[PDB]
């Protein structure tokens, strides 16, 4: 269930890493490299994840809550770009209480990385679906 995002990889290392990349294709590649750091979710735990759907790809997204209220998220995806975008989202949300996550948008980091400006429109529906799954999970907790 475990992954590096939030712990060994953070919003500020993503920011420092993406900031130099001015060619958008370099952002794209960084996005893909980032998603290769996401470990494979075994079919076992894809079943305990809610299936979220964009316009081209599926993502799986689960969560647990420690007793101190912190939420651990986990997920997987088949497309490499979508694995990158999911890694960015996990970096944004991992380790936060339900209270802390209803404070800003889950997708603010995608803007901060310069990623939204050039992604296809179709991505926005999957991103927005991810955002509302997070919002919904904080509602359940």
Author numbering: 7 to 147
What do the authors report?
In living organisms the sulfur atoms needed to synthesize vital sulfur-containing biomolecules, including molybdopterin, biotin, thiamin, the heavily post-translationally modified tRNAs and the ubiquitous Fe-S clusters, are mobilized from L-cysteine as highly reactive persulfidic sulfur atom species by PLP-dependent enzymes known as L-cysteine desulfurases (CDs; E.C. 2.8.1.7). The persulfide moiety is then transferred to desulfurase-specific sulfur acceptor proteins tasked with channeling sulfur down the appropriate pathway to its final destination. Unlike SufE, CsdE becomes inactivated in vivo during cell extraction under non-reducing conditions, presumably by disulfide bridge formation through the only cysteine residue in the CsdE protein sequence (Cys61).
In order to shed light into the consequences of oxidation inactivation of the redox-sensitive sulfur acceptor CsdE, we determined the crystal structure of a disulfide-bridged CsdE dimer at 2.4 Å. We used single-wavelength anomalous diffraction at the selenium absorption edge (Se-SAD) to phase selenomethionyl-labeled CsdE crystals that diffracted to 2.95 Å, and performed phase extension in nearly isomorphous native CsdE crystals to 2.4 Å. The final model contains nearly all CsdE residues except for the first 7−8 amino acids, which were disordered. It consists of a two-layered α/β-sandwich with a central three-stranded antiparallel β-sheet (βA-βC), surrounded by seven α-helices (α1-α7); the reactive sulfur acceptor Cys61 is located at the tip of an extended β-hairpin between βA and βB. The disulfide bridge has a favorable stereochemistry and is well defined in electron density maps. Indeed, the dimeric Cys61 conformation is roughly halfway between the fully protected and the completely exposed conformations, thereby representing an intermediate state. A remarkable observation made in the CsdE dimer is that, while Cys61 presents a fully exposed state as in persulfurated (CsdA-CadE), helix α7 is essentially unchanged with respect to the free forms of CsdE, and it is only slightly tilted to make way for the outward-going Cys61 loop.
